[PDB]
Amino acid sequence: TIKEMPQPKTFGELKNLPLLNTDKPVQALMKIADELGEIFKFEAPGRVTRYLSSQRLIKEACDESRFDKNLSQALKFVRDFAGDGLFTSWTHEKNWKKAHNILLPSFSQQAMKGYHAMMVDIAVQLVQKWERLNADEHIEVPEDMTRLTLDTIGLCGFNYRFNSFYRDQPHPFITSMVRALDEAMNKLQRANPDDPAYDENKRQFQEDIKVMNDLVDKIIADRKASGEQSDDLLTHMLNGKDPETGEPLDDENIRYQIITFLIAGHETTSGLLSFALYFLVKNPHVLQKAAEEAARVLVDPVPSYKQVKQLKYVGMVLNEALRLWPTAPAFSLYAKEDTVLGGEYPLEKGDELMVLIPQLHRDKTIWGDDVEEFRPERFENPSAIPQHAFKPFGNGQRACIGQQFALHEATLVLGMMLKHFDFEDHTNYELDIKETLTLKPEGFVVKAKSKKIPL
Ligand code: HEM
Ligand SMILES: O=C(CCCCC1CCCCC1)N[C@@H](Cc1ccccc1)C(=O)O
Ligand SMILES: N[C@@H]1CCCc2ccccc21
Ligand SMILES: N[C@H]1CCCc2ccccc21
Numbered sequence: 001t002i003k004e005m006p007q008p009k010t011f012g013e014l015k016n017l018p019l020l021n022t023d024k025p026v027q028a029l030m031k032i033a034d035e036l037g038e039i040f041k042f043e044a045p046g047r048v049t050r051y052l053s054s055q056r057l058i059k060e061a062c063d064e065s066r067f068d069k070n071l072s073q074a075l076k077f078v079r080d081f082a083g084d085g086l087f088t089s090w091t092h093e094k095n096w097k098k099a100h101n102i103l104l105p106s107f108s109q110q111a112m113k114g115y116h117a118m119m120v121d122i123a124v125q126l127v128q129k130w131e132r133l134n135a136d137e138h139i140e141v142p143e144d145m146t147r148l149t150l151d152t153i154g155l156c157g158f159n160y161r162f163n164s165f166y167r168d169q170p171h172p173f174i175t176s177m178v179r180a181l182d183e184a185m186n187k188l189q190r191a192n193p194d195d196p197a198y199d200e201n202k203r204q205f206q207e208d209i210k211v212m213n214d215l216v217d218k219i220i221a222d223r224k225a226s227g228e229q230s231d232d233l234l235t236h237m238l239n240g241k242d243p244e245t246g247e248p249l250d251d252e253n254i255r256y257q258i259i260t261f262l263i264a265g266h267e268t269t270s271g272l273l274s275f276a277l278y279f280l281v282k283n284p285h286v287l288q289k290a291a292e293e294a295a296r297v298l299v300d301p302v303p304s305y306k307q308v309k310q311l312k313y314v315g316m317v318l319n320e321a322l323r324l325w326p327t328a329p330a331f332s333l334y335a336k337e338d339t340v341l342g343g344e345y346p347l348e349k350g351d352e353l354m355v356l357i358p359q360l361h362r363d364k365t366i367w368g369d370d371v372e373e374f375r376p377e378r379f380e381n382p383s384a385i386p387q388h389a390f391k392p393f394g395n396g397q398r399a400c401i402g403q404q405f406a407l408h409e410a411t412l413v414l415g416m417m418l419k420h421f422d423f424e425d426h427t428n429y430e431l432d433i434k435e436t437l438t439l440k441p442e443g444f445v446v447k448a449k450s451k452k453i454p455l
Pocket of ligand 3: 264328
């Protein structure tokens with residue numbers, strides 16, 4: 001029966017907008033969900049979002065006949081530099097299905113066999129860094145995980161070394177990209193974006209866009225000139241033809257795809273690894289079980305593709321980390337037609353929804369009494385998990401194209417970490433979650449003790 005939707009506290013003419021005037025807006029929306037329940041309406045001047053938290057409503061939202069991917073205001077601001085790349089394109093834009101058809105074979109489980117050697121190159125650099133720390137020293141976990149995942153996509157993406165493990169200060173491309181991502185998220189909080197107080201922010205944003213376009217356009221121009229045929233995404237994009245249109249991607253679209261993959265390499269897999277290590281050091285019995293698997297499976301100096309596929313428990317640890325702290329914490333949908341959600345909430349064509357993935361993953365009606373516990377065994381049997389209960393990679397045709405790539409890299413790296421080191425939570429770290437487009441532990445530090453196993 002038709003029901004009024006709950007709404008959080010309002011601030012006069014600003015409606016709900018000041019609630020997201022925080023450096024931690026996803027965590028603020030999570031606390032609102034805990035108070036108000038499975039659905040609430042969020043109003044700002046000239047916009048309304050509905051936030052979904054229950055598997056009961058999210059299983060309907062994931063119906064692709066009724067709901068399509070929406071560009072949230074965040075993705076609309078990211079589109080100023082990610083353009084009509086896969087992540088910031090509407091499903092109905094020609095370049096979405098065209099790039100999707102061309103890039104799917106580059107991201108398949110088969111393709112991971114070709115990327116494996118480049119992933120091992122960077123993973124070996126991480127292990128050697130930790131082997132070379134002095135007794136007195138500690139590891140900055142998200143810092144080192146972000147060095148690794150950025151370098152991996154640089155090498156598999158377009159055969160470029162960011163050489164992040166040689167640096168204290170990021171490569172200039174990365175300085176610009178991080179500052180562009182920060183400006184996109186900060187613009188969400190501006191009641192009056194045209195006020196001249198923000199004129200410096202706008203000039204810096206254009207300069208940062210220019211820096212990203214110049215390196216990426218030069219890399220594309222340099223590859224075309226040389227005719228080199230490396231086994232990277234850039235070669236696949238320069239050579240590939242969409243079976244449907246018979247057309248290749250143009251150079252502008254290739255640039256947007258590369259910027260998109262570099263954003264992913266910086267923002268996502270690094271968060272997953274950082275949360276996975278956090279949960280392992282907080283759950284020593286789980287760390288022991290994962291370390292025992294790494295020791296039994298990784299019998300060679302270098303992991304092989306086939307050995308990574310056999311790290312089943314490590315896979316389960318990664319899924320249980322994605323459950324409790326999904327590094328990509330939301331995706332947006334619009335109603336394709338007038339419709340009723342959950343027999344209760346009427347929606348008009350075009351109405352926007354936001355899926356709060358961390359809340360979905362805490363639904364006690366799905367996961368049971370032990371929902372706050374880190375228990376990778378709950379992923380033993382995928383058929384035992386209710387439909388649409390677990391969405392860390394999004395939904396349907398607009399799900400993460402990088403899912404196989406991220407899980408292969410994360411499983412390889414976590415396996416090698418568990419083979420090579422014992423870990424100590426030497427500070428009794430209190431979880432502090434920094435938000436960009438994604439969630440990461442901030443200030444998470446550990447000490448490693450080498451098991452002295454040669455590479
Ligand atoms: C643990 C790591 C990752 C997580 C949790 C993750 C999560 C997501 C999610 C939730 C979406 C759906 C977004 C939406 O509906 O708006 C998505 C889309 C996407 N991801 Fe990832 N991602 C990860 C890693 C990667 C990597 C490494 C890449 C590329 C190298 C990548 C590339 C993309 C792209 C291109 C899309 C858009 C797909 C499309 O609409 O056609 N992701 N990702
Ligand atoms: O829910 C949020 C704030 C958390 C985004 C987190 C999201 C950003 C993309 C990647 C996944 C994580 N933003 C909505 C609604 C909105 C719009 C304008 C002003 C304030 C809120 C939006 O961007 O459409
Ligand atoms: N994995 C996609 C593309 C890269 C950045 C991002 C951020 C939030 C959610 C999904 C994604
Ligand atoms: N993105 C890397 C580049 C190398 C330097 C650095 C430092 C902290 C955190 C990340 C990074």
